[PDB]
Amino acid sequence: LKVVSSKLAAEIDKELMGPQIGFTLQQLMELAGFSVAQAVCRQFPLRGKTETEKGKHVFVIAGPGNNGGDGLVCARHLKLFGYNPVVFYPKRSERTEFYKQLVHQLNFFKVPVLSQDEGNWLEYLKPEKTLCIVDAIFGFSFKPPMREPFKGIVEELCKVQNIIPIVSVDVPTGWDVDKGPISQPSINPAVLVSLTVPKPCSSHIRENQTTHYVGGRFIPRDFANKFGFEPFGYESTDQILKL
C-alpha cells in the first residue's frame, strides 16, 4: 500500500513529458484510458450476461481537463471491447487540440457524446439503463471548492452510487487527493483505478466496498524508486494490476 503525494504526482507527470524522458501526452493518455477500460471489462465481464443485460450502457462523465481526456480514450476502447458507452462531456476547453481530436475519434466509433443540456444526461442515472458509471471528472490536480455544474453532478451521482457502481479514474472526484473524503455527500466508488501510482486518498477506500486497480504501465524501476515507490507487478501484458 505505497502511495505518492499530489505534489510528487505533479512532478512525475512534469518529468515524464519533459525533454529528457520524451513521453507525449497522446501516448500517456491513450495508455491511461486503455487501463481504465480494461478494469471495467475485467470488473464487469460480458460473458454469460443476456442480450437484454448487455443492452445497458457504460455512462462516462468527462471533466474539462486531463482526467476527462482519459475518459474519452476509455470510452473508445469500451466500444471496441463490446460495451455500449455513452459520454457526458459538459465543459470542453476549446483550446486543447487533443481533446477535440479524442471527441472526433468517438464520433468515428459512433459513441454518443452528450452536452451540458441537449443530452438529458440524468436518464442515464437509472439502474435499468446503465451498467456502471465512469467518474472521469477531476484528477489528482483537483483543488476545492468544486464549482458548478460539477458540484451538482457529483450530488446526483452520490444519490445513486449505492445502486449503480461508479468506477473512478485516478482518484474519486471530490475527495481530497491527499487527505481523503472531506466534503459531503462524498463519492463511494465500486472501483478505483489509480493511474501511474495511487495517491494518498486511495488509502481511504474500503476493500469490502471498493476494488482497487492501478494502471499506466510506463514506469521504469529507477524512476519509481526515485519517487519513493516500486514499479507495479503488472501480470502478463495487462495494463492494470489488482491493488
Ligand SMILES: [Cl-]
Ligand atoms: Cl483534471
